[PDB]
Amino acid sequence: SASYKPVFVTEITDDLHFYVQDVETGTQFEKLMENMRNDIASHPPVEGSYAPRRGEFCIAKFVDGEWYRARVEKVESPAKIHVFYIDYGNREVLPSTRLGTLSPAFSTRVLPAQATEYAFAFIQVPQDDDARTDAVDSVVRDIQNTQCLLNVEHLSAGCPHVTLQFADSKGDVGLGLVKEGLVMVEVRKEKQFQKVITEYLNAQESAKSARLNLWRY
């Protein structure tokens, strides 16, 4: 199975998942953000016209001083509201003074949340916090906030598992983590994955021999 879609990778999570945007809708997103930000500058949220509730959409003012679409998760207190940036995938805890009403002109009905969560096919996320940080750091350095090609491999209990390809035919991103000894291979049993799993296990044997990262000792 091979249908590669150009995506813009926006966020690598600490659990080695990632969020991507469909390159196709990138310009609509760009237009919406400029429109929305203009509005916000003319009509700044007044306190407290917005009351944060878990599940509720909003605008949130990010650390660059700019406003983005978001959705409220945990409300700890008015000083500590957990939000999820729906078009990008990152999360943040902010005070209610950095939140506002998401006006219907810029709603999810006008343009759907632009970020989709995925995981890497064929690999195991390291359980040790230190090892996992090393893997996340490699992915952040190499693909975060860049364009990639994505191929959906299969469904899973959580988000779908996919392979990513670097731009400029540099290859399979997850496989690269294996070759570097940063992650172990998940040995899939399905027939159509037999050849790719063989490729991954060979890379993993190479990392083991070279005693890289996870295989240091």
Partner 1 sequence: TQFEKLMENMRNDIASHPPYAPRRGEFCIAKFVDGEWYRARVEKVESPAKIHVFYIDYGNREVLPSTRLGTLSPAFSTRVLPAQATE
Site residues (vs partner 1, CB under 8 A): 1, 3, 152-157, 160, 189-190, 192
Nearer to partner 1, 133 or 156 (CB): 156
DSSP string covering 31-63, please? HHHHHHHHHHHHSPPPTTS----TT-EEEEE-T
What angle (nearest 5°) sits at the alpha carbon of residue 111, between those of residues 106 and 112?
A: 120
Looking at the Cβ atoms of 3 and 42, the one nearer to partner 1 is 3
Least Å distance, CB 156 to partner 1, is: 7
Query: What's the gap between Cα 22 and its chain centre?
Result: 12
Residue closer to partner 1 by CB (options 156, 202) is: 156
Q: Least distance to partner 1 from the beta carbon of 165, Å?
A: 16
β-pairing, 123-124 with 184-185? antiparallel
Rounded least distance, CB 89 to partner 1, Å:
17
Which residues, in sequence order, are CB contacts of 187 under 8 Å at separation 6+? Answer: 197, 201
Q: In the bound complex, what is the minimum distance in angstroms from residue 43's beta carbon to partner 1?
A: 35
For partner 1, the closer CB: 189 or 216: 189
Cis peptide bond upstream of 176, omega within 30: no
Quote the least distance from Cβ 119 to partner 1, whole Å: 13
Considering beta carbons, is residue 78 or 112 the nearer one to partner 1? 112
For residues 110 and 64, what is the distance between their CA atoms, to the nearest angstrom?
Answer: 25
